[PDB]
Amino acid sequence: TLRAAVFDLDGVLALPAVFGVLGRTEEALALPRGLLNDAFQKGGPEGATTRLMKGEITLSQWIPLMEENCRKCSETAKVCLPKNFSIKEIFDKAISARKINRPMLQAALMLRKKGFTTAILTNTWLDDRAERDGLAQLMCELKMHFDFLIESCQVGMVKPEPQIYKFLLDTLKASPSEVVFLDDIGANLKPARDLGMVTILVQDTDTALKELEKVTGIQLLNTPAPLPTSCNPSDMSHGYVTVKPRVRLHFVELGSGPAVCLCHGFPESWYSWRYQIPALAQAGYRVLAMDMKGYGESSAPPEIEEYCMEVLCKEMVTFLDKLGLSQAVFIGHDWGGMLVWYMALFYPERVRAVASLNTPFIPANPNMSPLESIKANPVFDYQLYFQEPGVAEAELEQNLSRTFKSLFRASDESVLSMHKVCEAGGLFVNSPEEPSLSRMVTEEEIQFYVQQFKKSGFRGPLNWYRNMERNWKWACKSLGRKILIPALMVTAEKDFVLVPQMSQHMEDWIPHLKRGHIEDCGHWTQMDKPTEVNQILIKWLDSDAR
Amino acid sequence: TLRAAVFDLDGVLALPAVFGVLGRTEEALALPRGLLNDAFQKGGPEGATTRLMKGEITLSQWIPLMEENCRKCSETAKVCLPKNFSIKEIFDKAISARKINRPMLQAALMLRKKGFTTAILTNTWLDDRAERDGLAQLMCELKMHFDFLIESCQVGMVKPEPQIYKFLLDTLKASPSEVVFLDDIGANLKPARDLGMVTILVQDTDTALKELEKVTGIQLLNTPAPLPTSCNPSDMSHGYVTVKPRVRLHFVELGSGPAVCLCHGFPESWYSWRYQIPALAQAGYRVLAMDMKGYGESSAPPEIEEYCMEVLCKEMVTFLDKLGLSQAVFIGHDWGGMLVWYMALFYPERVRAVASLNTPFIPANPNMSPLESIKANPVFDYQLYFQEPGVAEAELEQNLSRTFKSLFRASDESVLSMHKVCEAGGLFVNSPEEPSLSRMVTEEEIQFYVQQFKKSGFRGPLNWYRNMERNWKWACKSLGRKILIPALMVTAEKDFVLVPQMSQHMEDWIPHLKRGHIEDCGHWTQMDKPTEVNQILIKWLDSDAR
Numbered sequence A, B: 001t002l003r004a005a006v007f008d009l010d011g012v013l014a015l016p017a018v019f020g021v022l023g024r025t026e027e028a029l030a031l032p033r034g035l036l037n038d039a040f041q042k043g044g045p046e047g048a049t050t051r052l053m054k055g056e057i058t059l060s061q062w063i064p065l066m067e068e069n070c071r072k073c074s075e076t077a078k079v080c081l082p083k084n085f086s087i088k089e090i091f092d093k094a095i096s097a098r099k100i101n102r103p104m105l106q107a108a109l110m111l112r113k114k115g116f117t118t119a120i121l122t123n124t125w126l127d128d129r130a131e132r133d134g135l136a137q138l139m140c141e142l143k144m145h146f147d148f149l150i151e152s153c154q155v156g157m158v159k160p161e162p163q164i165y166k167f168l169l170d171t172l173k174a175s176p177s178e179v180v181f182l183d184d185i186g187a188n189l190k191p192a193r194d195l196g197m198v199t200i201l202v203q204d205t206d207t208a209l210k211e212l213e214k215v216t217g218i219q220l221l222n223t224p225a226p227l228p229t230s231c232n233p234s235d236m237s238h239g240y241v242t243v244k245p246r247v248r249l250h251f252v253e254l255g256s257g258p259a260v261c262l263c264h265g266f267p268e269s270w271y272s273w274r275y276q277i278p279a280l281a282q283a284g285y286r287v288l289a290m291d292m293k294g295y296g297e298s299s300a301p302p303e304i305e306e307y308c309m310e311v312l313c314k315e316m317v318t319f320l321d322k323l324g325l326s327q328a329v330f331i332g333h334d335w336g337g338m339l340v341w342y343m344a345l346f347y348p349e350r351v352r353a354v355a356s357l358n359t360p361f362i363p364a365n366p367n368m369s370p371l372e373s374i375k376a377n378p379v380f381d382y383q384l385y386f387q388e389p390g391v392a393e394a395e396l397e398q399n400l401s402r403t404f405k406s407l408f409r410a411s412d413e414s415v416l417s418m419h420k421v422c423e424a425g426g427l428f429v430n431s432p433e434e435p436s437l438s439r440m441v442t443e444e445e446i447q448f449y450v451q452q453f454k455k456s457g458f459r460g461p462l463n464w465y466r467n468m469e470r471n472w473k474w475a476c477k478s479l480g481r482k483i484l485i486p487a488l489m490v491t492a493e494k495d496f497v498l499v500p501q502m503s504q505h506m507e508d509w510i511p512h513l514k515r516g517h518i519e520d521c522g523h524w525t526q527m528d529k530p531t532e533v534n535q536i537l538i539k540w541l542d543s544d545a546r
């Protein structure tokens, strides 16, 4: 039975292929057919190209040898190469043009999801060109999705040499009949077949995937749209900053480019951004996904006043100071969204741009006590239940798995009504003891939140709600201001507490506000509709934040 | 007795002042004298500018109010403002032109070094202009050097209001006679004097500093050149990446821009880069200062083979992968310098540029065993002493304070001869029990290294030396290559083991190599000559690495 799938890079996982560019260049320059492909393969196992592919020489050392082979070939063919003929230019363009073959990667991702071991086996070179970063980026994006990456220039062997196939099997820890091997070069497929592997000659992707699904018995074509790439907590870079003596903030960090600081809601984690972290890093951003104060690996002091907006914002400014960042774009959800609006109002110099998911910006009413304002909207009743220290902690900490399974559900799966929470005597009083698992989360993902909340519980998280008066007095100092930095408001159709209509007057205070809207999306925006969140955020970052 | 020094920002810590730009603009445009300074202060305590300085409105909201005041003033003066008059343009230019007053900052740094509490007290605004980052950067650089930063727009009070002076004293926890207060505005100096503070009216910096040194009794003028800013370990962002099941790498991270990965030598720490970290971050780079495998907070497995160059390099590539970095510039010293050359030879696509301090690049000799090569140079005798597992560990771990105090000394302070180490029976056999403290290090800095080495000791660090044969076989695979990526070799005149002449043939293998050279510098380059290292590295980064 098959249990391993091996893919070539050029012409399989990445298109268009290099062999095609030599043929394309011959045609564009009206050179004899095959002239450049001949100079490229000149000397066969003893030639310049084999030396490059084995890692004996670098790509920049190889360029003049390929130039001399082209001259020899042209001399023999009794033709002249054009006036401004350049091997460097031809390869720079071809490498830059080559992009991931998305349906082929999707098929590899599905086989791996189904328990296959996956690998990339490639005849490649040591790239020292000034433009090498583009290729480094492609390989980075690709390699993360596979168990192994075997590069000819690192192992000192090349396809079709028999040794590289024995090396492949040793690394896979598999017998040949257990392996599918996909290649666009029939000659490089021959030794794998000779060993007894299943082989697929890739011309067009659709046919190759039909052969691959027929031989594996796994649906790979016509499949439902997959979710964005998620995060494995043990595979991330974890950062820690002391903002004051008893307060440390933890964050997960991925990517390069402008800093993007993700701020989660209640009762969440950095992990609530799992579907956004890889997508934003891939889009050219340096992502910093926080455990907000009171959560996960960040400090959770017990005092209510440690959680007022003024202090939380001051600490986030200190966080930037200690990291040596003059600015970050701030993106928040729920309580994180309320924080990012206040970061924009009090520290605009430090905020590159601001985005909120669900949480609208509503100026404080100086003529009404915040408790009166909460009482005025029936959907905010749960905030009154959260006031008394210890009451909601007892209910939320009683059974962690039940807490997260009851909370984290799509709009059509709800188990909690948020009206008359105080009257009912809790959030979960009419909820099952053993809730079903929402289609939004796996059992493993629920257990990650359970493990994180074992450290500090719900005191610090609930304390974010216990500073209504303090936050109202501080917010009133900002009433004459407008938010004039780049701003995005993302509404969720089916969030029945943070209703889209609550955001309706935001342009009065944020005149240049840009918007996004997600249909059939409940409160847990990032995990409910991750593809759409990623689309809205990347589009806005690229246009408004750099 | 004085124990606190307070500095204004505009016209004191940062020059040229804003008041000067309004006067300069009046003159350049031939407007009536004082017209713009009049419109700026219009309405006094009730005016637009006071509202801005108190944080009632932002800088972008203030712009049209200042425009209306300029029009009113011009109408009263019976003059016309020019055709393309713009308050936005005038302030963008002035803010951008304003730079840190380096001698004033140096004086604050010295008073703080001598035990004074220091603070910045400033009438400032909430900056929401599109070009706000420049000012955010200035404030970041400045604020790190002071105990407190009091901004009028954050406290809702302005100089010369009496309340802000009482607020200052409360934050300083000092009586007025204990405070020196420096301001360029005599009217803002008046309430501090009225309270009994020592006050200095800053016109030219030299006179202000003469008054400041006369009143404090501390030399501030004509002082020796200070060292670059160092790092406080508890103030840094600390990152952790698992590269494989039992291996985690720790690093300290500071700044934004291209990633710069600093790789220390034997037997060191991320902390060996303490003088480079702030300077490189300030120069526009994202610094990642590693604890190399076997050191500090990084994992230290016991096996010799975990420390061969091939594995150490593979792990550094995985480190980049997990952080989501396609490249980093790699800068190494000693064993770190040997590593970065190998990163350049085996992973050029991942190396933006490469620099080594002291460690030259010498290709492996395939016709001589590495042990024969070590035996051929008498200064390399200590490497033979390091071979036998446990021998050097016993000597180095016996008394940590003695180990680091004996090792870390300037060229004119040496206590260790490196010739006939095996014959002598150790590195410290002719060294004192209680070595004196080198002028390069403080007692506290020695204790940091002592604390770091308490975790894993010297087994992992010494294992970097125990892979001579393995490293030689791997290096031989690279003999046909050249290093063609941007490269810098920094030699140290007085490193008596890694002599500058050892680097003499490097251009044969690295044709485009750039160089730096430090006179009167021993082995501990970064701490021996930090100002000169910083100069050489920043110049090379800005020209060759981005």
Ligand SMILES: CC(C)(C)c1cc(Br)c(O)c(CNCCCc2ccccc2)c1
Binding pocket: A266, A267, A334, A335, A338, A359, A360, A382, A407, A495, A496, A497, A498, A523
């Ligand atoms: C209490 C839970 C987590 C179940 C919940 C469920 C829904 Br549906 C929801 O919309 C919110 C929103 N919490 C808002 C907190 C931040 C905030 C406070 C005051 C005003 C606006 C936003 C919370």
Ligand SMILES: CC(C)(C)c1cc(Br)c(O)c(CNCCCc2ccccc2)c1
Binding pocket: B266, B267, B334, B335, B338, B359, B360, B382, B407, B495, B496, B497, B498, B523
């Ligand atoms: C052993 C100590 C730390 C005292 C020392 C003192 C001096 Br002075 C010195 O120059 C070196 C250099 N160590 C070099 C290690 C890396 C390397 C190995 C082989 C060849 C070159 C460089 C080490």
